[PDB]
């Protein structure tokens, strides 16, 4: 289409995020247009402009003076902004919309004081699976998939309890089989 | 009035309910640009110079059509009823050039206050109708929001040739002869 | 070589 | 603002179905998206004053219709593979900006018989955990189920918790070799030691699964996958 | 007679240039048969009732964000947008006229298939300016983006007399004069 955005982007949880996005073949008669989606969801209306700055309670739009690119402002980046980012044009017309590739936002939390530790919860009566807790872990660490085929290890998630304001990230690993260990369950 | 250097139409918007009927146009200084045929979703531009630089979707022509069919539904009841009154309409034949016996030219039959925007234009070279050579421009705009339409016809001028327009119109009581 | 608009038709009260 | 439904559907192929949506109150226009990993989002058609306005480039088949209160629904037929998406519905007051629904996930199957509810389990935290960190993390597990139309949500004492909850994004295939492959999904709950250390205090782990209706047929041996729920509960223990 | 009824409704979203580009003036214009009974003035800055008919149809779309957000920006992606188009193609465009005399005692002097609108048409007796016998019609728009006007002169022509006409149009470099001599 009209815009080209970066494929990936990432943000640190508290500070503001700024999202690129070029289109310099764009009309004088076509608004940018600003979508999200998070996963599981349908697209959600953030911000429209036609020329310069434009601001709303979600978001900050900021059109250069050529018109030929723009900046999604997001003022204080939290966990829930992380979605993939639509930036698209249009006449307002009464025509359809235009999607291109967007720009997934991940916005990864600081961990002040890591605590990486594996743990091993307690079995279920019924299931017949040991599962592993990788928890307290920093931002950057890496959780690989499982490469057996009886074991497997989710992504790492993020969770945040919010009366204490502590944020911690956690991988899953389970598995049925006979001999399986939460020691080096994960790499 | 508003004084102006020039006025642009970018839109001229119609729709009727005989037919029922719409129309799409942009004009500039009087003059039509194009019109958006609803039928065929294709702009008419009415200039080679147009055609070779300029664009126009069609899609927003049917896109405001439909509004005012929704809004004209909606003035209606709001009206009681109130129907448009038929005006009458005031034709003209001219030629588009001095007409020499034996060179080609064209003869021009202008129809103009015409209201509502429903009208039958035909030619006649002698006391029967012509086919070849007649087109029509679409209804263009007034500022007294009524309509005016010309009618084309190409032939060689004779000495025996006596052209006919005829006007068929709701105001009119029979249809106007114009003779040239 | 870019679309150009007219201008947009407003929709009455009638639902 | 908008509503659409259903939220889930399975069908085979050859069936039609129709999926509804509710504008904006206020709103006029009515747009249908289909939303694929491979093709993006395809403009279907939008609807005004009870008429269809735009159209775009879908067969025949895919038909739509607008109703006096600009309420809108959209029809299916002769159903394929391939029609397997995420269908939007978009609200505008007539011409300007688009405020999209929830969506229908429509799933498009050869057959019936891969469909299968979940298994749910929780897990109790660690002790080693508790004496450590001062915290306590439950996970939950929903294991085998197909397709990938479940909302998991955790209930302690009654109510549904959002705070320190972490809901797997994408569920994992537990085959991943195999295109009818089931999926698993994982849940995690992390509360104060003292709060979980209080036998009077709660843990539910609920999953709703969308699966087949009352209408569908059904021939083989085991229960039919049903729209139903799945949970596991655990108290807390001193 | 015995004419069908009919329900006619108009939209017209007109732009006013002055001084090129300095000057712009967006009225849109909602018409119910031939009354005006709503507008949008951008002088104005939002939408007003001209009729009794109107109250509600300016009452919502001044309520309505949207609506009086893209009305207000039409000033700018519809009349200043397509108005550099012009400068490219419309207001470029030059179509010299034809100057022909015939006569009819009157004697006719024909500017045919110009463009633009501005022209300039006098007679002369012997290079002495004519008024007092001088018809001019209005300036006749042909519908196919030329004009044409028809200036005529009564006369009674003697002797040795050659009748002129001069014709100035922004086309042209000099003024174009046709001769006329009686038989
Ligand atoms: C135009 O077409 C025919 C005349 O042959 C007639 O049926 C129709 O009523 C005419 N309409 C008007 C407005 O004269
Ligand atoms: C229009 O043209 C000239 C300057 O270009 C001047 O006589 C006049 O004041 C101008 N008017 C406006 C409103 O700019």
């Known amino acids: 289409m009209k815009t080209t955005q ?15 996005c070029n289109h310099s073949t764009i009309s ?12 599981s969801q349908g697209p959600q209306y953030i911000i429209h402009g036609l020329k310069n700055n434009e601001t709303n309670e979600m978001a900050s739009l900021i059109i250069t003076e050529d018109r030929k690119s723009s900046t999604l402002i997001l003022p204080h980046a939290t966990l829930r902004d992380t979605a993939v980012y639509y930036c698209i044009v249009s006449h307002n017309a009464g025509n359809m919309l235009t999607f291109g590739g967007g720009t997934r936002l991940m916005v990864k939390p600081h961990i002040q004081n890591p605590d990486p530790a594996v743990y091993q919860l307690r079995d ?8 592993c807790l990788f928890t307290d872990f920093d931002s950057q660490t890496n959780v690989s998939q499982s490469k057996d085929s009886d074991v497997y290890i989710t992504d790492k998630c993020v969770l945040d309890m919010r009366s204490m304001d502590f944020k911690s990230n956690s991988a899953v690993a389970w598995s049925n089989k006979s001999d399986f260990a939460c020691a080096n369950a994960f790499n | 009035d508003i004084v102006a250097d020039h006025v642009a139409s970018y839109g001229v918007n119609l729709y009727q309910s005989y037919g029922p009927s719409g129309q799409y146009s942009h004009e500039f200084d009087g003059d039509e640009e194009f019109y958006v045929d609803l039928e065929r979703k294709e702009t008419v531009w009415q200039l080679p110079l147009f055609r070779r630089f300029r664009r126009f979707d ?22 009681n009823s109130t129907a448009a009154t038929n005006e009458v309409p005031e034709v003209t034949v001219f030629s588009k050039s001095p007409v020499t016996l034996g060179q080609p030219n064209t003869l021009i039959c202008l129809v103009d206050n015409i209201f509502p925007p429903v009208v039958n234009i035909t030619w006649l070279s002698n006391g029967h109708s012509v086919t070849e050579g007649v087109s029509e421009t679409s209804f263009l705009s007034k500022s007294d929001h009524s309509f005016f339409k010309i009618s084309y016809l190409t032939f060689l001028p004779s000495a025996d040739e006596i052209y006919d327009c005829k006007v068929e119109h709701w105001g009119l009581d029979e249809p106007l002869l114009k003779h040239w | 070589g870019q679309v150009e608009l007219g ?5 009455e009260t009638c639902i | 603002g908008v509503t659409q439904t259903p939220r889930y559907l399975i069908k085979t192929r050859g069936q039609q179905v129709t999926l509804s949506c509710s504008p904006i109150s206020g709103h006029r226009s009515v747009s249908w998206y289909q939303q694929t990993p491979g093709q993006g989002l395809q403009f279907l058609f939008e609807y005004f004053s009870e008429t269809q306005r735009n159209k775009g480039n879908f067969p025949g088949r895919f038909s739509g219709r607008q109703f006096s209160n600009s309420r809108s629904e959209m029809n299916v037929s002769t159903l394929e593979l391939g ?14 900006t688009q405020y999209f629904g929830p969506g229908t996930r429509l799933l498009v199957l050869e057959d019936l018989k891969n469909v299968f509810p979940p298994e749910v389990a929780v897990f109790e935290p660690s002790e080693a955990e508790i004496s450590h960190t001062q915290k306590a993390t439950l996970v939950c597990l929903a294991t085998g189920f197909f397709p990938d139309h479940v909302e998991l949500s955790w209930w302690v004492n009654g109510k549904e918790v959002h705070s320190g909850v972490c809901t797997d994004p994408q569920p994992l295939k537990e085959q991943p070799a195999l295109n009818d492959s089931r999926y698993a999904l994982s849940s995690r709950l992390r509360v104060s ?5 209080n036998p009077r205090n709660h843990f539910r782990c609920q999953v709703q699964f969308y699966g087949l209706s009352e209408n569908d047929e059904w021939t083989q041996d085991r229960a039919k996958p049903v729209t139903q729920i799945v949970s596991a509960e655990a108290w807390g223990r001193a | 007679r015995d004419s069908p009824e009919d329900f006619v409704y108009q939209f017209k979203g007109m732009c006013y240039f002055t001084n090129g580009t300095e000057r712009v003036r967006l009225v849109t214009r909602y018409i119910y048969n031939r009354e005006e009974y709503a507008r949008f003035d951008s002088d104005v800055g939002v939408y007003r009732a001209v009729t009794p008919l ?8 001044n309520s309505q964000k949207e609506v009086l957000e893209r009305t207000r920006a039409e000033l700018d992606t519809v009349c200043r947008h397509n108005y550099q188009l012009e400068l490219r193609t419309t207001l470029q465009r030059r179509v010299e006229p034809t100057v022909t005399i015939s006569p009819s005692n009157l004697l006719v002097c024909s500017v045919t298939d110009f463009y633009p609108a501005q022209i300039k048409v006098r007679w002369f007796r012997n290079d002495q300016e004519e008024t007092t016998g001088v018809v001019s019609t209005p300036l006749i728009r042909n519908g196919d983006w030329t004009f044409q006007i028809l200036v005529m002169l009564e006369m009674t022509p003697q002797r040795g007399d050659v009748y002129t006409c001069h014709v100035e149009h922004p086309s042209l470099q000099n003024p174009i004069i046709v001769e006329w001599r009686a038989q």
């Open chain 1, 28 to 39: 004088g008669n076509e608004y940018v247009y600003w979508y999200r989606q998070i996963h």
């Open chain 5, 54 to 61: 109107g109250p509600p149809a300016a009452e919502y779309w």
């Open chain 1, 124 to 131: 279920s009566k019924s299931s017949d699976k040991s599962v």
């Open chain 4, 193 to 197: 030691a003292t709060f979980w250390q």
């Open chain 4, 83 to 96: 029609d397997s998406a995420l269908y939007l519905c978009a609200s505008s007051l007539e011409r300007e």
């Open chain 2, 58 to 79: 069609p899609q927003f022509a049917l896109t405001n059509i439909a509004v005012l069919k929704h809004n004209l539904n909606c003035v209606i009841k709001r009206s």
């Open chain 3, 7 to 11: 201008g947009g038709s407003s929709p």
């Open chain 1, 6 to 20: 970066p494929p990936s982007m990432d943000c640190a949880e508290g500070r503001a995020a700024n999202l690129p």
